[PDB]
Amino acid sequence: SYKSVALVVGVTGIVGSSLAEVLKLPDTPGGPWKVYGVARRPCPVWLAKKPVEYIQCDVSDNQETISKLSPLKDITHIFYVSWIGSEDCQTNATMFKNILNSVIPNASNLQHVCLQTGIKHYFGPHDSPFTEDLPRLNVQNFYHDLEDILYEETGKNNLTWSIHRPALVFGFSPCSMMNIVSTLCVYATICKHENKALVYPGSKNSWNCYADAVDADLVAEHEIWAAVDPKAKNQVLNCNNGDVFKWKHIWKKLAEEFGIEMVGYVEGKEQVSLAELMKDKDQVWDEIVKKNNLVPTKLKEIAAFWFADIAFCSENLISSMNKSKELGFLGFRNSMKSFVSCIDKMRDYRFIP
Amino acid sequence: SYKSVALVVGVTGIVGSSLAEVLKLPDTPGGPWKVYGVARRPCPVWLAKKPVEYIQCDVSDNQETISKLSPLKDITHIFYVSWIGSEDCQTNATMFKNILNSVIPNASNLQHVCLQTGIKHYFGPHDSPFTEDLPRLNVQNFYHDLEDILYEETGKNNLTWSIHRPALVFGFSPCSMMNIVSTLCVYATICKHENKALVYPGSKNSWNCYADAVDADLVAEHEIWAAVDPKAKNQVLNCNNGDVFKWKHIWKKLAEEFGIEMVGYVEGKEQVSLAELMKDKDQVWDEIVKKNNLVPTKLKEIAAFWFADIAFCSENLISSMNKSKELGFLGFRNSMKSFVSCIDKMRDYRFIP
Numbered sequence: 001s002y003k004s005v006a007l008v009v010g011v012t013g014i015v016g017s018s019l020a021e022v023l024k025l026p027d028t029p030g031g032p033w034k035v036y037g038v039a040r041r042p043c044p045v046w047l048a049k050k051p052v053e054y055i056q057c058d059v060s061d062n063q064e065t066i067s068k069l070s071p072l073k074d075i076t077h078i079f080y081v082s083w084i085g086s087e088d089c090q091t092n093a094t095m096f097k098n099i100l101n102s103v104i105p106n107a108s109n110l111q112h113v114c115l116q117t118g119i120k121h122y123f124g125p126h127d128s129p130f131t132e133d134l135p136r137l138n139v140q141n142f143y144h145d146l147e148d149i150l151y152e153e154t155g156k157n158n159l160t161w162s163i164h165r166p167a168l169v170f171g172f173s174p175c176s177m178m179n180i181v182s183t184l185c186v187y188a189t190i191c192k193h194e195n196k197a198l199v200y201p202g203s204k205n206s207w208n209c210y211a212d213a214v215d216a217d218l219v220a221e222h223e224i225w226a227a228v229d230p231k232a233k234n235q236v237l238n239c240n241n242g243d244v245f246k247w248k249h250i251w252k253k254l255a256e257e258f259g260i261e262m263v264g265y266v267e268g269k270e271q272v273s274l275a276e277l278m279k280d281k282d283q284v285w286d287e288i289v290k291k292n293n294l295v296p297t298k299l300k301e302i303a304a305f306w307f308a309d310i311a312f313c314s315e316n317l318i319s320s321m322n323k324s325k326e327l328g329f330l331g332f333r334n335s336m337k338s339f340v341s342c343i344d345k346m347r348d349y350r351f352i353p
Numbered sequence: 354s355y356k357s358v359a360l361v362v363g364v365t366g367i368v369g370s371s372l373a374e375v376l377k378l379p380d381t382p383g384g385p386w387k388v389y390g391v392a393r394r395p396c397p398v399w400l401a402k403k404p405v406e407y408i409q410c411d412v413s414d415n416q417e418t419i420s421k422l423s424p425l426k427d428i429t430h431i432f433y434v435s436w437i438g439s440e441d442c443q444t445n446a447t448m449f450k451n452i453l454n455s456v457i458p459n460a461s462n463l464q465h466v467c468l469q470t471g472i473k474h475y476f477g478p479h480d481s482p483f484t485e486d487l488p489r490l491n492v493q494n495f496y497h498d499l500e501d502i503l504y505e506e507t508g509k510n511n512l513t514w515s516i517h518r519p520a521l522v523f524g525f526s527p528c529s530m531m532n533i534v535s536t537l538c539v540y541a542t543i544c545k546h547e548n549k550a551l552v553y554p555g556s557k558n559s560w561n562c563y564a565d566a567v568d569a570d571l572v573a574e575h576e577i578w579a580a581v582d583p584k585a586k587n588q589v590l591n592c593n594n595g596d597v598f599k600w601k602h603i604w605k606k607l608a609e610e611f612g613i614e615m616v617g618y619v620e621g622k623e624q625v626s627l628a629e630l631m632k633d634k635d636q637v638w639d640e641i642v643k644k645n646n647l648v649p650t651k652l653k654e655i656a657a658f659w660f661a662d663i664a665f666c667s668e669n670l671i672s673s674m675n676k677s678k679e680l681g682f683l684g685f686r687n688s689m690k691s692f693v694s695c696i697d698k699m700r701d702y703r704f705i706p
């Protein structure tokens with residue numbers, strides 16, 4: 001009953017969860033899609049609401065991965081949208097290897113492997129706007145190892161490949177290790193709960209510089225596009241919303257969305273660590289979860305305040321989308337509207353109040 | 354034999370000359386187009402090579418404009434892509450008024466008026482990225498007067514309107530008062546002629562900041578789009594290539610295109626005036642024109658070194674293209690390729706060697 005069969009590795013992820021939604025849409029290219037969804041944790045109740053076949057599997061475990069993925073003979077497309085959570089090149093490589101060694105010898109109709117890395121490929125720095133043809137930096141980066149494995153395995157087995165390097169992701173998953181919007185929404189939620197203004201903790205430059213990002217749905221569209229369009233086969237491809245923004249403008253919108261007052265960047269002041277400010281807010285979040293009858297999340301799991309700290313001390317990281325556009329991909333998002341869209345969606349899904 | 358009849362006011366201009374080419378293409382929306390081309394100077398020999406009906410007319414002269422434009426009964430679309438060359442609000446307004454008072458009472462099939470202004474509407478400043486809904490600055494700007502005239506005249510006479518605010522234009526016209534690419538090509542040409550490196554004269558920030566621009570052909574496409582598409586009627590619309598660049602990268606490409614060595618921005622050094630450096634190069638340019646058998650241009654007419662000086666002390670002027678994209682306009686250009694395209698085209702047309 002299916003035309004294509006997808007293996008989404010990291011289905012609970014910030015992009016994986018989007019693929020779980022987009023792939024199942026009736027007019028999605030390559031459809032109708034059958035979707036295998038792989039993650040380490042037991043299937044979340046909110047993901048059980050989706051028509052995907054969830055496979056709980058520790059992908060870093062070769063024998064377990066072989067055991068659970070080798071019976072899947074009908075897979076045609078692999079979407080690797082995971083990482084182990086550390087910068088370890090070897091343990092990250094093992095995960096991707098295990099996926100490949102378990103599926104390739106068992107899926108006689110396998111066609112394409114989508115590999116998701118990121119713009120960190122460009123600065124670990126190269127100057128921006130980042131273009132896909134920029135050579136690797138002379139450092140260790142697990143993105144490098146993943147690429148080399150991709151080239152080696154797809155070539156020997158007559159498979160097409162695509163490398164996707166998304167910018168900062170605007171998404172809705174509460175299970176992501178790096179979800180900036182959920183992180184800021186939690187921070188805003190705690191501020192309103194304690195009757196405090198939304199105080200910008202970041203640096204001056206990050207407040208005022210041009211920044212870019214990518215909607216999680218657009219990444220999914222981009223990866224599906226490369227999975228079905230011949231023009232995008234065997235290509236390295238950046239992926240962002242196609243525009244630029246400033247955190248100063250996002251911050252104001254975030255404050256309005258939560259109906260609280262805002263304290264923007266103050267001249268002379270240095271950046272403060274959000275990870276430190278929120279260090280002891282675990283019980284407060286538990287109270288908010290209960291009172292608002294939200295989907296039960298741990299503060300540590302829905303928010304990554306350390307990740308916001310890095311974003312708020314970064315600049316000059318704009319990536320170019322010209323290559324994808326010249327290849328025919330005309331997908332885009334208004335980044336300001338995308339950010340608001342993610343807030344509404346996480347409220348919708350009762351991840352945040 | 355024509356479906357639409359265009360009045361291009363400023364046909365020798367950096368955008369007007371592009372309209373003269375694009376409108377006459379067979380698959381251009383609204384085609385086949387008849388094109389009236391209006392400018393003050395006698396018709397250039399290179400413009401006589403185009404199938405447009407040239408009308409030499411001083412548009413600031415009401416009686417002359419009435420005399421030459423009132424017999425044109427068949428006009429359906431007006432493309433105002435001119436200005437007088439000064440910031441004078443009244444003399445600029447008179448030009449636009451004279452066009453309207455001469456055509457509207459005489460063109461019974463008039464439908465739409467395209468008004469081209471620019472991003473100067475946003476800083477004369479507002480913060481960027483500039484969006485079309487930003488209110489007018491509390492200053493005198495002839496863009497304001499042109500808009501008010503547009504609203505007033507189109508409303509009373511049941512006409513649709515469109516306001517186009519292009520970014521810095523990458524074009525090919527040698528008759529433009531503000532052509533940055535021709536200006537830099539002339540500078541590069543003189544450098545190679547005097548056996549000197551392409552020394553960057555601008556500021557540090559302009560060398561290193563994100564910048565945007567718009568291809569002259571894309572502006573034409575954008576204005577034609579608004580002229581034929583209902584979704585774009587009665588809208589204020591930005592127009593850029595849809596990406597960003599840095600002058601540091603453009604400068605390197607410019608040096609390669611002319612086969613000469615480059616001296617980029619040097620730390621500690623202040624900006625130098627190009628208008629001063631090139632002040633006495635008129636005869637040198639005449640020599641280059643003769644030796645290379647180029648189309649006869651005066652240094653003052655093909656180059657605007659004062660304009661490059663302003664561009665090389667500017668920053669934070671990025672404009673947003675989201676509105677046009679959300680309205681269905683998916684036209685774009687790779688700015689780096691667009692810049693190279695303009696160089697090749699001016700060499701093609703023998704404006705530069």
Ligand SMILES: NC(=O)c1ccc[n+]([C@@H]2O[C@H](COP(=O)([O-])OP(=O)(O)OC[C@H]3O[C@@H](n4cnc5c(N)ncnc54)[C@H](OP(=O)(O)O)[C@@H]3O)[C@@H](O)[C@H]2O)c1
Pocket residue numbers: 009010011012013014015016038039040041042057058059060081082083084085095116117118119165166167168169170173175176177178179180
């Ligand atoms: N997030 C961003 O903003 C962003 C932006 C640009 C690029 N990237 C890059 O995109 C890539 C994908 O990261 P992401 O941010 O999409 O990840 P994410 O949202 O944090 O999700 C990671 C997914 O991988 C799964 N996973 C982790 N370890 C596993 C294991 N041992 N076995 C099975 N599944 C495992 C997780 O499930 P469990 O939770 O059950 O383990 C989760 O579903 C990364 O390389 C990242 O650097 C991310």
Ligand SMILES: NC(=O)c1ccc[n+]([C@@H]2O[C@H](COP(=O)([O-])OP(=O)(O)OC[C@H]3O[C@@H](n4cnc5c(N)ncnc54)[C@H](OP(=O)(O)O)[C@@H]3O)[C@@H](O)[C@H]2O)c1
Pocket residue numbers: 362363364365366367368369391392393394395410411412413434435436437438448469470471472518519520521522523526528529530531532533
């Ligand atoms: N150039 C850019 O980079 C740029 C970027 C953004 C916005 N803009 C804006 O776009 C608008 C159009 O300017 P542009 O740069 O396209 O102009 P341009 O390339 O300098 O050409 C101006 C045109 O207007 C004609 N003109 C001037 N005075 C006239 C008169 N009295 N009677 C008849 N024709 C006359 C000129 O013909 P003659 O030479 O024969 O007089 C010329 O064809 C301006 O408001 C400008 O601010 C320009």
